[PDB]
C-alpha cells in the first residue's frame, strides 16, 4: 500500500470542548468531507493499521543439502505406485511405473 495513502489530507483534530470525540477531522470547507475524520484505521478513508511494505521478508532460502534431500525423496516417491495412486493419477493400464521409453 502506498505511503501517501491516507496522509494526503491535512486533518488537525478538534480537541476538547465539542461533541466530537478526538478524531483528526478535515479543516473547514463547505464540502461533504468537512470535519469528517481521517488519520486512523477506524475512519472512512484514511489509512489502515500496519501499511504493507515492499521490504517484507518475501523470499526464503533453504539449505542446498535439504533441497537435494527433498528432490531425492520426490524422485524416490515418483516410484512406488501406492504413493502415485494416493496422489491421484489413473494408473490402471500403465505397464511399468518407472516408465522408461526410448531415446526416440
Amino acid at each position: 500500500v502506498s505511503e501517501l495513502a491516507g496522509h494526503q489530507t491535512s486533518a488537525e483534530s478538534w480537541g476538547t470542548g465539542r461533541a466530537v470525540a478526538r478524531i483528526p477531522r478535515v479543516r473547514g470547507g463547505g464540502t461533504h468531507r468537512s470535519g469528517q475524520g481521517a488519520f486512523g484505521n477506524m475512519c472512512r478513508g484514511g489509512r489502515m493499521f500496519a501499511p504493507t511494505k515492499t521490504w517484507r521478508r518475501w523470499h526464503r532460502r533453504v539449505n542446498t543439502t535439504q533441497k537435494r534431500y527433498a528432490i531425492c525423496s520426490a524422485l524416490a516417491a515418483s516410484a512406488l505406485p501406492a504413493l502415485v495412486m494416493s496422489k491421484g493419477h489413473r494408473i490402471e493400464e500403465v505397464p511399468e511405473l518407472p516408465l522408461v521409453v526410448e531415446d526416440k
Binding site: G17, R18, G28, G30, T31, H32, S34, G35
Partner: peptide, 24 residues
Amino acid sequence: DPVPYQPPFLCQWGRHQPAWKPLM
C-alpha cells in the same frame, strides 16, 4: 446549494458567563 458547515463553537460556558458556575 452548498453543504452547510458544522455549527460554530459557542464560547458559552467559561469564566465570562455567570449563568451557572461551580464551586470555586
